[PDB]
Amino acid sequence: QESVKEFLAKAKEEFLKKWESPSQNTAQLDHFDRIKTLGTGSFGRVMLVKHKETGNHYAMKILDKQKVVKLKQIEHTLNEKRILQAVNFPFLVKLEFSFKDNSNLYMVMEYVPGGEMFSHLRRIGRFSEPHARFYAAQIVLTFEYLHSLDLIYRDLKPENLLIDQQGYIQVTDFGFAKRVKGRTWTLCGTPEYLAPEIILSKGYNKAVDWWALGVLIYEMAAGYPPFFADQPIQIYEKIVSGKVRFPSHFSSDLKDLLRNLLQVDLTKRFGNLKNGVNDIKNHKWFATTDWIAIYQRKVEAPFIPKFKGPGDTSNFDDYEEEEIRVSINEKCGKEFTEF
């Protein structure tokens, strides 16, 4: 419909203006109080912080420059910040500030207190099809938005989907997101969610996100992912094989959609055909979905996370609390000039 076409045209205009003139240096570390580590990885962490003047809470991602360099994530880190400061969509966590110092890079995001979908899914076991469908619809709209901007996301998994106070999804972690008009080649993403063409070291495209959506919908509705095995090499063998087993409790419509998203041949995969995303939106499994009402956040969510207020961390887990040290000397200044 022309209304969707004009929406996406405006979305791309607004993205490009910020893309071509990125914001930089919009806060500093001593404007915030550190509260609690919410997650950690090989080159950084995410911490709940509170702004000292406004009292607002944020999730601050802190990346160690020297580790980013050592683990060959420079371009990915520059992609992450440049994309986040340019996008705007109801189901994406919002970047509020960014800055750097002698040691670290900082991306200060809205704090979503309801926790990761991964926690809720593993607690309940599996989501009913209507519950899975509510979340899947949000990812479909989000990928329609990102792909129309020539952005591939490349990190879909339950850990990256935060549940907000209204029960809606907020996608976090743009560390693998990239502006790509055609193909791209980097090996990245978690093993269970990789498309076959990533595993086979091909030049791949945005069809890998639609494969990952198939994995996510399967895992939400089953409680475990479709290509599960003990070690990555065994997972990769199952992914490239072109066979899946569906639980008998899956509806026929759900199985049909999944066979079309988990299509090994990327030229036959839903989302990547002539009709693009509309083959997904018009599929029978989504017949009950009001796409506009989802976008407008007018649908009552299936699940509202339990939390006490905007500073509650009970839906996140516990990690060793480490210093945020800042060297007296500048590290890796050249590499991160544009940040």
Ligand X SMILES: CS(=O)(=O)c1ccc(O[C@@H]2CNCCOC2)cc1
Q: Out of 42, 252, 275, 314, which residue is the one contacting ligand X (CB under 6 A)?
A: 42
| 40 lies in the binding site for ligand X (CB under 6 A) | yes
Q: Nearer Cβ to ligand X, position 162 or 235?
A: 162
Phi, psi of 89, rounded to the nearest 5 degrees: -155, 150
Q: Is 295 annotated as a binding residue?
A: no
- Residues in region 165-184 near ligand X by CB under 6 A: 175
- 64 as an active site residue: the answer is no
| Joined tokens for residue 135 | 């979340």
Which of 15, 19, 32, 44 touches ligand X (CB under 6 A)?
A: 44
- Residue from the set 11, 15, 45, 49 that interacts with ligand X by CB under 6 A: 45
Q: Tell whether residue 45 is among the known ligand binding residues.
A: yes
Whichever of 191 and 196 has its CB closer to ligand X, that residue is: 191
46 counts as binding ligand X under rule CB under 6 A: yes
The interface region with ligand X, picked from 33-41, 91-99, 187-195, 206-214 by CB under 6 A, is 33-41
For ligand X, which is the closer residue by CB, 11 or 216? 216
Name the one range near ligand X by CB under 6 A: 1-9, 42-50, 149-157, 284-292. Answer: 42-50
106 or 285: CB nearest ligand X: 106
Number of residues in contact with ligand X, rule: CB under 6 A? 12
**Considering 33, 64, 150, 155, which one is annotated as catalytic?**
155
Taking the complex as a whole, the smallest distance from the CB of residue 44 to ligand X amounts, in Å, to 2
Q: Which residues 275-314 are close enough to bind ligand X by CB under 6 A?
A: none
Footprint of ligand X (CB under 6 A): 39-46, 63, 116, 159, 175
**Which positions are annotated as active-site residues?**
155
Known binding residues for ATP are 38-46, 61, 110-116, 157-160
